[PDB]
A paper describes a structure:
We used X-ray crystallography to structurally characterize multiple states of our designed systems. The unbound structures show an open hydrophobic cleft in the new designed state X poised to bind the effector, and the effector-bound structures show that binding the effector causes the two switch domains to register-shift into the designed state Y. Structures of the target–AS1 complex show that the target binds as designed (top), with some strain suggested by small variations among the structures (bottom). For (1), the target dissociates 20-fold faster from AS1 than from an unhindered binder fusion, probably because of minor strain in the target–AS1 complex.
Author numbering:
A (entry chain A): 3 to 257
B (entry chain B): 0 to 124
Write the structure that this text describes.
């Protein structure tokens, strides 16, 4: 019903996040132009859950759902995208590791914000393998790959370059399931970012550490490389030292 | 000429500390903080009299005071190196986002080293 309007304002007078305030207004402003029972119920559930959440990742993903279902008018028109969001929310409730909860929701948000079906498919199947395996070490490795790959897609990377990035996502998961060390997995995340940007890298092994020199990275690319590596290194517990000098990023992975 | 930039810095600083009390959301206070660093750089650029380097330092201090971290400023020769400690992964990428953007609006080169909770920024001009 038009209780949506009430649930939306309630969040709008409660929010401290400006974008959350915008989505709540947008979700209610697209739902009253619909007579589909599913749409009015999906937005109702979404606004209700986000009204009872203190985690900004959940609130944003729930509102991003309600806007995605209210605009399409049909739940079937976004039923794929709807699944990826309902999988991360389920995984978020299943785990007790705050890095896993943040990694699952952020990867779903980034995948939904990105318009690429390859990212949607990848994150979906990455969440399914995470929910299937009850191994937290494997789940963190899967999310470090998926959330990184999603950041490439939301950065507007070419579909020809996301193809080469996905091959490294597959390689990273396969290596993780064979008990690869966290340093090896962090190196492969960097390998994914580099191949997802049309760039080359140089590796050096001065001792039990790896030095990676990346050349010709644009300013908008260096930000998202920093965000993906820092998140994967925090998931794996790896210490990385990243240096930004001109157009050359130097990452030192230490174990 | 410089009094205008300092007065604007003081107004964005008290707005940063006002949102620091709320802590309504973790990334929200960070995106609000980098926007404030952006408004200061775009303001100092409108006063070409003001030191382009000192503008970047002010925007960095704005970010430090917004996130509640600590800062140490080392001045040697013409370059200035700030060492910021106590950053999490989200504050790390946000501080980098503000420095990279204010360094451009002001036309300044920066060298940034991220390691753990510490970000070391060299401002040269």
């Amino acid at each position: 019903k038009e209780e949506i309007k009430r649930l939306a304002e309630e969040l709008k007078e409660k929010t401290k996040n400006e974008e959350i305030k915008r989505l709540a207004e947008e979700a209610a402003e697209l739902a009253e132009r619909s007579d589909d029972p599913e749409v009015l119920e999906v937005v109702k559930k979404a606004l209700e859950e986000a009204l009872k959440s203190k985690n900004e990742e959940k609130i944003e993903l729930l509102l991003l759902v309600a806007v995605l279902v209210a605009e399409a008018g049909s739940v079937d028109a976004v039923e794929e995208k709807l699944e990826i969001a309902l999988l991360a929310l389920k995984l978020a409730e299943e785990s007790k590791d705050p890095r896993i909860i943040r990694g699952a929701l952020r990867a779903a948000i980034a995948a939904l914000r990105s318009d690429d079906p390859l990212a949607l498919k990848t994150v979906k199947e990455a969440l399914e393998r995470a929910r299937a395996s009850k191994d937290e070490r494997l789940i963190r490795a899967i999310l470090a790959a998926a959330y990184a790959f999603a950041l490439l897609a939301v950065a507007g990377a070419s579909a020809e370059r996301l193809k080469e990035a996905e091959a490294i996502v597959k390689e990273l998961i396969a290596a993780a399931e064979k008990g690869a060390s966290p340093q090896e997995l962090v190196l492969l995340v960097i390998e994914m970012m580099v191949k997802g940007m049309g760039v080359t890298m140089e590796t050096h092994r001065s001792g039990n550490e790896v030095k990676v020199v990346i050349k010709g990275l644009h300013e908008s690319q260096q930000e998202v490389l920093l965000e993906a590596v820092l998140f994967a290194a925090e998931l794996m517990g790896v210490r990385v030292r990243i240096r930004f000098k001109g157009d050359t990023v130097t990452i030192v992975v230490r174990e | 000429g410089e009094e205008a930039v300092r007065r604007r810095f003081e107004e964005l600083l008290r707005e940063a500390l006002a949102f620091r009390e709320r802590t309504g959301g973790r990334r929200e206070t960070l995106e609000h903080a980098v926007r404030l660093a952006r408004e200061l750089a775009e303001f100092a650029a409108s006063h070409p009299e003001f030191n382009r380097q000192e503008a970047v330092l002010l925007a960095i201090e704005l970010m430090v005071r917004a996130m509640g971290v600590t800062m140490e400023t080392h001045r040697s020769g013409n370059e200035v190196k700030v060492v910021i400690k106590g950053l999490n992964i989200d504050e790390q990428v946000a501080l980098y986002r503000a420095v990279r953007e204010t360094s451009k609006i002001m036309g300044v080169e920066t060298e940034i080293e991220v390691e753990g909770d510490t970000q070391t920024i060299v401002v040269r001009e």
